[PDB]
Design a protein around this ligand. Structure first.
Ligand SMILES: *[C@@H]1O[C@H](CO)[C@@H](O)[C@H](O)[C@H]1NC(C)=O
Lengths: 55, 171
């Protein structure tokens, strides 16, 4: 069935590319290509909360 | 109380002694007044402060620690998480309430002990140079001026000096 007017579906995928490594995309169709990506600095012991209180 | 003094044979406290937890009220020819017993009061303050500090000190901080999220095929692990959080909540709530109960009892009992021991301390200095009323008070069989009173308060009372005079008024 249709969701938001579309009977099609798109699946979303992600990966963390380590420094110095290479990622390769090959396709003969159906690829939703990366346009922008994000270089990340990692840190521990946090998480996500839900609140309507003002920051 | 366990030691029978506070709310015991000494029915009540003294709103007139503002400068210490324990101490003395005297009346003699020179005048009348309260004076805190500094040593026992300070020992009790240090002890109780150490108790409170020790309760708070043992809670090594919780470093950044958070809730976990789960998808719709992860109900079992979500529930494991909930079991853990709830279980810890049961343990810490029971322990905190019960610990506070028991330690409160101990603190009150500690005060009762300190009062009884101060009373018996004075009693053992004075012996039969005074008669015990029973309400925490001692009545001298000899004249006891301000210097004498202070000697009583700091544990330097001179029993032989006043013994003969005491013996004279007692008989
Ligand atoms: C206690 O008081 C008496 C009487 O004033 C005095 O002689 C004595 O030096 C005092 N003792 C202390 C512990 O200072």
């Amino acid at each position: 069935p249709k969701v938001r007017d579309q009977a099609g579906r798109m699946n979303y995928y992600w990966t963390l590319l380590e420094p110095g490594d290479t990622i390769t995309f090959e396709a003969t169709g159906n690829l939703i290509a990366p346009w922008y990506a994000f270089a990340l600095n990692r840190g521990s012991g946090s998480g996500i909360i839900t609140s309507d209180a003002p920051v | 109380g366990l030691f029978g003094a506070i709310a015991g044979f000494i029915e009540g406290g003294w709103t007139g002694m503002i400068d210490g937890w324990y101490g003395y009220h005297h009346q003699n020819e020179q005048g009348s007044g309260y004076a805190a017993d500094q040593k026992s009061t300070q020992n009790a303050i240090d002890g109780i402060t150490n108790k409170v500090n020790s309760v708070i000190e043992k809670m090594n901080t919780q470093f950044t620690a958070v809730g976990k999220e789960f998808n719709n095929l992860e109900r079992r692990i979500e529930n494991l998480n909930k079991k853990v959080d709830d279980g810890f909540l049961d343990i810490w709530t029971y322990n905190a309430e019960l610990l506070v109960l028991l330690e409160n009892e101990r603190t009150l009992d500690f005060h009762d002990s300190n009062v009884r021991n101060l009373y018996e301390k004075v009693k053992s200095q004075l012996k039969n140079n005074a008669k015990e009323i029973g309400n925490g008070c001692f009545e001298f069989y000899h004249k006891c001026d301000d210097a004498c009173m202070e000697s009583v308060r700091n544990g330097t009372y001179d029993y032989p000096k006043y013994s003969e005079e005491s013996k004279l008024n007692r008989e």
